[PDB]
């Protein structure tokens, strides 16, 4: 409404309720609304990072975001005891447990990867669930398997902290551009999981791409990475009677449909509507048969282990376990016809789950929590990055260098405060290491924290005095080397210009670093950085004469969707005032079929470094079809 008088600040003082996603943003009062809404979008666009860390400057709600986002970790909801463990694959297995109080029987599934959509997914740390053994009790709130975001005590991290300096690196950091050290780029690593379905009909066969003559392997094995970016190639046959081109079976052809992806396959699921005898008799199914049998063995075992539980009088079984048992029993039972898309399918359908560690590449977008945006223009060696020399902090290398121009225009001042806070914190850390006893070190720590956040100081003193001296020494060394925890709440509890002023004036020794080849003094401080979903691969297109529906189904390596030329483009080309050449390009590339065939032939038969094309003047195929139809109508163009 026109009146904003309804809002009274005293009511919301000390309360962060009006913030939602901005609860993950430090110093949110200083950041503009536009940057904040961009940050809210970026959080959804963020991708999981292998080496994610808890932020050095944190709002203290991040861990809560990890707890209430159930997609990343599995927590038991009751006390359980491990009844048994059954394996389908080395990577994937199921664990049968019984509630120690209720008596209900439940199951947990272990796999390395989680598929989200498209290529997006994340790996699982299955250390605890693999550690669990038969006759081992599972406590109430234990975390069986977790995402890389969570740490040993389940603290939540959506990004990595990188040393940042605002510096103009050969003008490469122009507008929203970033230059990164190779190690830092190693820190920004994402997982990609892809589920690819290969459908083989009765007369279709899979080529022996991955196997020798004695052993037929048409697709990678459970532990093997893809080679040449081809999972498998399918050859469709009209009848399959002859099987005469056995030498062509090993070879590959243009007619054969190839499926493209990269990574290590971690699970294969085969759905078969073909009689076992047909698979056994023909050698090309041997690999498939083996995996099919493996599934069957697993299925049979679970039935044998759990039949008494399911049909027994107690029948204290969870619905999840019941449905899993019923599905396995359906598999072992005969006359089971599998259907895909509401139709019975010939042959068999195979689903591959493929996991690849994807590194940071040029054109990828990484950003901070304050609405700033950045594109990775160049990845450079660590030595080439600004390195301060001849100081106590000698050899400090900048992980990322950001554009200095326009920082104030962006209206996101808080990023500078994070950088500067970590820089002064670097000074405090070196001061603690340099001199004093453990008591002096904790005293310096408490002084700095009281300057930043008093509540953090009080809780930190509680934690410090609670720790025994050995634990205190370990905590002190961790603070000196790994980093310093600083708490900056989003709206209430943040520091300001005056507080930073006090921090700089009291610690008079703190001044800018003079780097090796840089005349201007620089500030190098850790900034939290997150990786966004956007990558150059998504929008890449390439076309050569011969929409890419194959690329979406993984049958083409990259999209071949053609670019479209329109009236605006034709006018901009007509600026040249050589309409004939524009028509030549249009007809040779698109409109005229004969001219396009001639262009391909001339390009392949002509001089390699000299290209001069002569194109015949002929009516287009569209023109021929139009002339035929109009004469049938009885109408012809006159005075063309």
């Amino acid at each position: 409404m026109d009146d904003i008088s309804v809002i009274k600040n005293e009511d919301y003082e000390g309360s962060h309720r009006f913030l939602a996603e901005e609860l993950l943003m430090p110093n949110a009062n200083k950041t503009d609304g536009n940057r904040s809404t961009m940050f809210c979008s970026h959080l959804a666009q963020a991708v999981t990072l292998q080496k994610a860390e808890p932020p050095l400057v944190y709002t203290n709600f991040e861990n809560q975001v990890g707890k209430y986002s159930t997609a990343g970790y599995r927590k038991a909801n009751s006390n359980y005891k491990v009844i048994e463990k059954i394996y389908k694959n080395d990577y994937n297995y199921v664990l049968i447990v019984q509630d120690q109080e209720t008596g209900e029987y439940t199951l947990f599934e272990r796999a390395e990867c989680e598929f989200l959509t498209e290529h997006y997914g994340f790996q699982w740390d299955n250390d605890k669930i693999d550690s669990l053994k038969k006759d081992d009790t599972i406590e109430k709130d234990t975390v069986l398997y977790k995402n890389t975001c969570y740490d040993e005590n389940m603290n939540f991290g959506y990004g990595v902290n990188l040393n940042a300096a605002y510096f103009s690196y050969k003008n490469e950091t122009l507008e929203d551009a970033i230059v990164i050290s190779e190690s830092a780029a190693k820190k920004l690593g994402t997982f990609s999981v892809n589920k690819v379905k290969v459908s083989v009909n009765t007369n279709d066969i899979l080529l022996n791409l991955y196997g020798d003559n004695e052993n037929y392997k048409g697709f990678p094995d459970i532990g093997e990475h893809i080679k040449n970016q081809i999972i498998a190639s399918r050859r469709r046959f009209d009848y399959n009677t002859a099987l005469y081109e056995l030498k062509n079976l090993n070879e590959m052809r243009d007619s054969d449909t190839p499926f493209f992806a990269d990574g290590k396959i971690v699970d294969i699921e085969i759905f078969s509507n073909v009689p076992e005898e047909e698979l056994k008799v023909q050698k090309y199914n041997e690999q498939v048969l083996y995996y099919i049998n493996k599934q069957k063995e697993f299925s049979n075992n679970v039935y044998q282990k759990l039949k008494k539980i399911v049909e027994g009088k107690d029948n204290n079984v969870s619905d999840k376990l019941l449905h899993f048992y019923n599905n396995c029993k359906m598999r072992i039972d005969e006359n089971i016809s599998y259907t895909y898309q509401n139709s019975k399918f010939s042959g068999f359908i195979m689903e591959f789950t493929i996991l690849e560690e994807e590194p940071l590449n040029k054109g990828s977008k990484i950003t901070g929590r304050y609405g700033n945006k950045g594109v990775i223009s160049k990845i450079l060696p660590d030595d080439q990055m600004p390195t301060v020399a001849e100081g106590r902090f000698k050899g400090l290398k900048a992980d990322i260098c950001l554009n200095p121009l326009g920082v104030f225009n962006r209206l996101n001042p808080s990023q500078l405060i994070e950088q500067e806070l970590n820089w002064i914190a670097k000074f405090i850390r070196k001061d603690m290491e340099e001199a004093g006893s453990n008591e002096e070190k904790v005293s310096i720590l408490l002084d700095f924290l009281n300057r930043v956040n008093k509540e953090e100081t009080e809780l930190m003193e509680e934690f410090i005095n609670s720790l025994n001296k050995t634990e205190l020494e370990e905590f002190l060394n961790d603070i000196i080397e790994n980093g310093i925890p600083i708490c900056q709440k989003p709206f209430f509890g943040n520091i300001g210009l005056d507080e930073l002023w006090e921090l700089y004036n009291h610690y008079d020794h703190i001044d800018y670093f003079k780097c090796e080849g840089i005349s201007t003094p620089l500030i190098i401080g850790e900034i939290y950085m997150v990786r966004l979903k956007h990558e150059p691969h998504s929008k890449f297109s390439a076309r050569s004469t011969s929409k890419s529906k194959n690329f979406k189904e993984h049958k083409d390596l990259y999209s071949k969707t053609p670019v479209r030329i329109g009236n605006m483009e034709i006018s901009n080309l007509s600026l040249t005032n050589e309409m004939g050449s524009i028509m030549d390009m249009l007809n040779s590339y698109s409109n005229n079929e004969t001219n396009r065939r001639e262009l391909i032939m001339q390009l392949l038969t002509g001089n390699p470094f000299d290209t001069n094309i002569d194109l015949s003047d002929v009516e287009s195929g569209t023109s021929k079809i139009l002339k035929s139809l109009f004469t049938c109508l009885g109408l012809s163009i006159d005075d063309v």
């Binding site: 003008n171 030329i565 290209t611 009885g634």
Partner: protein, 410 residues
């Protein structure tokens, strides 16, 4: 539907050689030479012997009886409301018959006219007296009307367009009337029902041609005007490049390989003295992953190509001078994963794009003649503002560059 264009006299275009008088498509288990589906007159795409394009059109003779011109039926209907009643046998001249209408058309047209509303139509009918009556009906090539091959239990399935069912029907009606020379003994003319239904069938065939125009015939031509789908095209994200001239750019490994695939294979076949099929196999391997050998052939091509290796870069909307620019491929990147075009910051202002992850369209130019003509769109030629003749600030030093020069001089 409200279209004005020149009419055709079918008799002038009629050819006895391309005459379709047989309604049966197949003769003795092969496509009939005289049938509607005739390889003889229309051809076969597989065998080169056909030497006949789609423009080939068959012909039919309806003599000794004439049918109303299908295109002009609506125009005749507006002038003469009783045309539908008159042609069939069941005003004063209601249901006289088609042949009687043909003889008395001048009387009927004057009889049925609107002085104000249909004077324009009447004048057109006066202009086209000769084209009112149709003796020859055209049949378009069987190549355009496909018959999809399918297996059927009763017999092998013959697929036909909705119009194709009508075509075999239309030929049958006339065939019977001509066979009898003396048979009718003047006692009973049943030829009028056969001719009558034929007029509607041909009219619906004409309407089908309108639907065929709707079914990707003229529409595809309009699709080219809306957007001509150019092969040998690419799209790539833009990333800043430093250390190279304004006109030169950096092109990814995959982009160059596909765009210059046919150019590259020519070199590979010659250097290794191998067949083009064998050369394609090497190209496929290189596309899958970076190999030094294919990069070397590409590196030689960009260096030694006549006129350089050049392309057109357009940022849509292409509404401004400099939206499409003629640029040079200076270097080819050696990282398979890196798929970003490297462009000079000075080019950006003319293009109006930004390094925000948006994609720009790449149209390579191959012919040396086109390269010179499209070089009129090059950045150097656009250094002069066409409005004033002054220097173009779009190609000048930008924010980061200005600061360094300012520190140097001031």
């Amino acid at each position: 539907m409200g279209k004005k264009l020149s009419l055709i006299d079918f008799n002038e275009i009629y050819n006895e050689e391309n005459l379709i008088t047989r309604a049966n498509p197949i003769e003795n288990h092969e496509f009939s030479d005289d049938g509607i589906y005739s390889e003889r007159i229309f051809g076969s795409y597989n065998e080169d012997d056909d030497d006949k394009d789609i423009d080939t059109i068959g012909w039919i003779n309806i003599e000794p009886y004439y049918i109303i011109n299908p295109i002009l039926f609506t125009i005749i209907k507006k002038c003469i409301p009783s045309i539908n009643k008159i042609i069939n046998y069941q005003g004063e001249d209601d249901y006289i018959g088609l042949v009687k209408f043909k003889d008395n058309f001048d009387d009927l047209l004057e009889k049925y006219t609107d002085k104000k509303k249909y004077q324009k139509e009447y004048d057109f009918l006066i202009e086209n007296h000769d084209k009112i009556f149709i003796n020859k009906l055209p049949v378009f090539s069987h190549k355009l009307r496909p018959a999809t091959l399918l297996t059927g239990s009763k017999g092998k399935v013959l697929a036909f367009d909705e119009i194709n069912n009508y075509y075999n029907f239309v030929i049958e009606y006339i065939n019977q009337i001509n066979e009898g020379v003396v048979s009718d003994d003047s006692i009973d003319l049943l030829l009028l029902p056969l001719l009558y239904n034929m007029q509607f069938y041909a009219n619906n065939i004409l309407t089908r041609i309108i639907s065929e125009y709707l079914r990707g015939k003229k529409g595809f031509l309009r699709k080219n005007i809306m957007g001509s789908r150019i092969n040998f095209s690419a799209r790539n994200v833009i990333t800043p490049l430093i250390g190279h001239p304004i006109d030169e750019v950096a092109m990814p490994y995959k982009t160059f390989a596909e765009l210059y695939k046919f150019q590259l294979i020519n070199l590979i076949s010659k250097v290794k003295g191998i067949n083009y099929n064998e050369a394609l196999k090497f190209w496929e391997k290189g596309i899958l992953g970076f190999n030094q050998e294919l990069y070397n052939y590409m590196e030689e091509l960009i260096t030694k190509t006549k006129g350089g290796c050049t392309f057109l870069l357009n940022r849509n909307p292409t509404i401004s001078i400099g939206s499409i620019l003629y640029l040079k491929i200076g270097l080819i990147k050696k990282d398979y994963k890196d798929l970003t075009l490297g462009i000079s910051n000075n080019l950006l202002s003319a293009l109006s794009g930004d390094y925000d992850g948006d994609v720009l369209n790449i149209i390579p130019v191959f012919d040396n003649k086109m390269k010179e003509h499209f070089s009129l769109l090059s950045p150097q030629n656009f250094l002069v503002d066409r409005n004033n003749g002054r220097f173009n600030g779009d190609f000048d030093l930008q924010k980061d560059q200005i600061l360094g020069i300012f520190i140097l001089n001031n």
